[PDB]
Every structure is written in structure tokens, then in C-alpha cells.
Design a protein around this ligand. Structure first.
Ligand SMILES: CC(=O)OC[C@]12CC[C@H]3[C@H](C[C@H]4O[C@]45CCCC(=O)[C@]35C)[C@]1(O)CC[C@@]2(O)[C@@](C)(O)[C@@H]1CC(C)=C(C)C(=O)O1
Length: 114
């Protein structure tokens, strides 16, 4: 509920979200995993905290977050869910790993808070 705009949250929108959206492998993460549309009967049993980059993009627009660290945790949840749910050989796993590498590169260049 307490939410806000900081230099760091601004960077999460204008650099991190904007760069990741453009990647060739980003499209599966544009919206919540839909267990009905994708015929995944155990998804919501296995993954208790779903997250996707569409939801993060909206939270940033609605000043949902108090700090960039909160936003980073949601990206982490999005990636970790993919790794936990899927098999090691699944291409979606390699897609997530490519996105997460870029995410981390951007987080490392993020301006320090205050
Ligand atoms: C269609 C869709 O959106 O997903 C389907 C799929 C992910 C994407 C896959 C692929 C099937 C192969 O068809 C390929 C062909 C080559 C490459 C490829 O990308 C896709 C489209 C799927 O692998 C089948 C199952 C699966 O649903 C997930 C469960 O593995 C999810 C789906 C989602 C949204 C996430 C984030 C997750 O953790 O995992």
C-alpha cells in the first residue's frame, strides 16, 4: 500500500522493464501464466506466488512499490517460478536465464539509493 517513485524505481521502469520487454525471449512473461489457456493442471499447486513482467510493469506505473528492492524481488520470483515448474531441458528455462542475465547486468548499473 505505501508506494512511491524514486530514482531507482524510475530506472526499474525506464531501463530494466523497457530493455527486457524488447528481448526476443520475453513474450512468455508479458502476462500471468494462464493454467487454463496453457493446459497446466498442477501449475497453481506447485507455484504459490505467480509473477510476470506485465504485472511488474503495472505496479511500477501505479507506484505500488516503496523501493526498487521490492521490484527486484518480483523479477526474481518470476524467474524462480519458471526454473522450479519446468524441466531442465525445457527451452523456456533457457529463455528465463537469458532474460535474468540482462536483468542482473541492469541491476548492477542501477544508481545507488539516496
Ligand atoms: C505457449 C506458452 O506461452 O507456453 C508454453 C510453454 C512455454 C513456451 C514454449 C513451450 C512449448 C514449446 O512451444 C514452445 C516452442 C519453442 C519455444 C517456446 O517458447 C514454446 C512456445 C511450453 O514450454 C509448453 C509449456 C509452457 O506453457 C511452459 C509451462 O513451459 C510455461 C509457460 C509460461 C508462460 C511460463 C512463463 C513458464 O514458466 O512455463
Amino acid at each position: 500500500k505505501p508506494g512511491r517513485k524514486t530514482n531507482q524505481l524510475q530506472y526499474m521502469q525506464n531501463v530494466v522493464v523497457k530493455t527486457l520487454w524488447k528481448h526476443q525471449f520475453a513474450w512468455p512473461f508479458y502476462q500471468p501464466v494462464d493454467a487454463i489457456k496453457l493446459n497446466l493442471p498442477d501449475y497453481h499447486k506447485i507455484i504459490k506466488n505467480p509473477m510476470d513482467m506485465g504485472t511488474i510493469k503495472k505496479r511500477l506505473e501505479n507506484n505500488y512499490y516503496w523501493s526498487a528492492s521490492e521490484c527486484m524481488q518480483d523479477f526474481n520470483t518470476m524467474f524462480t517460478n519458471c526454473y522450479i515448474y519446468n524441466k531442465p531441458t525445457d527451452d523456456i528455462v533457457l529463455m528465463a536465464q537469458a532474460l535474468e542475465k540482462i536483468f542482473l547486468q541492469k541491476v548492477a548499473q542501477m544508481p545507488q539509493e539516496e
